[PDB]
Design a protein around this ligand. Structure first.
Ligand SMILES: Nc1ncnc2c1ncn2[C@@H]1O[C@H](CSCC[C@H](N)C(=O)O)[C@@H](O)[C@H]1O
Ligand code: NA
Lengths: 265, 265
């Protein structure tokens, strides 16, 4: 009788840790959700084949409204696993599910997996230099989200890099591209006019981290806004003040304009 | 012709991903470094047994000064792997190693694994709320560094959490405990008196992330400074003002005192 929160990693079924696989293999019941992120290099079938168990996929409503009615009851008399893309507790509200587990008398354990949050390291930007993070959300009706703009502003003033998670509508199979994020940011800039995000802003795009050949690109918005970065998922990053070696990596590995080598200390 | 940067994950030999393991198994030569951090829940022997390959350990000097003449020469005509605790390229100087590979005409790929940067999500603190990160270093001789204190101050001032890495003497296998970190911060507070870290400051301690039985404790410095959090490594976090959901998790899962539900929210 136990509940395991097991991360599946960044891109495909092999991104799960050995620990996660061996534990998942011996669980009586295996549940999972695929609405918090997108694993672009695998399928439910390949995941099931790898762990050797049939996986019951749950919707956001099943989880948020009925986790304690669907999953927890089984954990009381069996070993249950709950799979999620990336790391189960990063940029999700799944941590709160551990409280529901406790209140239901069910012990829970967490098995980590590679997360987009640390995979940013492959962009060459020092991870300790990232500041507050934010999510670029799709406007809906008359509601136009903009707080993420201020996050960038706050971090940039501090010389810190800003990680921008991009929106996702799993049931509609909508995955926000870095291009759409840039478009939205320019519109917010027009309204606020804080000089935070313009055509001359340097940005970094990372697509399909976890694959052997992820797309890593850096450059000015004016030049990248219409560039094809490949299939989703994507994340957008607005660097703050760059260290010499960060700039060198962006140029050498991410194809950034050589002019950014000349940092303005 | 190929160099693989493969992360070993958080705590033991099972924290490497399935992808990481299978790739390492096919490599002709396998190198590793344990100066950035150590795998406290395992040993080199156990990692070797799992990968089924002899592993050549590299010192900080081997990597920083001679990566191109120790690792790359072999990567030119063979499949070579470079193992590092956590997620590759998280350590500040590692990204630059990919530039050396490129310059030597060696292809390089990154195989991610869990990182403490994302694993701390198990503390129930929202990942997006983390600000700039820092490392607590021991004062030595006439040198008393305190920049990590300023980092806490700037983050907390903006309602952001501060991830604090604690000093490590890898070679000597000596770790700074969360207890020592707290005492140091209290000393820096007595000197700067900026109101940033006091007996009344709420902190979170995470020990042995990655293990099935990590230690997660939250509370006021006055009560945790002499508490036993178990064996290292320890990570210290100074949260900024809490979301009620973060507070509830710290109380129910981290044993935090109910008092934080009214004082730090
Ligand atoms: N492999 C990947 N490549 C690029 N972006 C990714 C990604 N995986 C997740 N993301 C980004 O993060 C968003 C999901 S947020 C949930 C993150 C997840 N728990 C983790 O640990 O990674 C996506 O919409 C996308 O913007
Ligand atoms: Na961070």
């Amino acid at each position: 009788m136990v509940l395991y929160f097991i991360g599946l990693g960044l891109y495909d079924e092999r991104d799960i840790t050995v620990k996660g696989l061996e534990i998942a293999m011996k669980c009586d019941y295996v549940f999972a959700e695929f609405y918090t992120s997108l694993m672009a290099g695998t399928t439910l079938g390949r995941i099931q084949k790898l762990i050797g168990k049939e996986i019951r996929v749950l919707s956001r409503e099943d989880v948020e409204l009925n986790f304690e009615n669907i999953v927890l009851p089984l954990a009381k008399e069996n070993d249950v696993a709950f799979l999620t893309p990336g790391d189960p507790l990063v940029a999700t509200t799944h941590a709160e599910l551990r409280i529901r587990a406790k209140r239901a008398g069910v012990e829970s354990y967490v098995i980590h997996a590679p997360s987009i949050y640390s995979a940013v390291g492959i962009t060459g930007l020092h991870i300790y230099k990232f500041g507050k993070s934010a999510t670029v959300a799709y406007p809906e009706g008359n509601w136009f989200p903009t707080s993420y703009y201020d996050v960038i502003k706050e971090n940039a003033e501090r010389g810190l890099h800003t990680l921008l998670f991009l929106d996702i509508k799993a049931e509609k199979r909508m995955y926000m591209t870095a291009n759409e994020a840039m478009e939205l940011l320019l519109k917010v800039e027009d309204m606020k006019k804080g000089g935070v995000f313009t055509d001359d802003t340097l940005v970094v795009v990372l697509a399909r981290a976890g694959s052997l050949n992820p797309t890593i690109r850096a450059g000015y918005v004016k030049d990248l806004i219409r560039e094809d970065f490949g299939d989703p998922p994507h994340i957008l990053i607005v660097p703050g003040k760059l260290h010499i070696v960060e700039a060198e990596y962006l140029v050498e590995i991410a194809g950034a304009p050589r002019e950014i080598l000349r940092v303005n200390v």
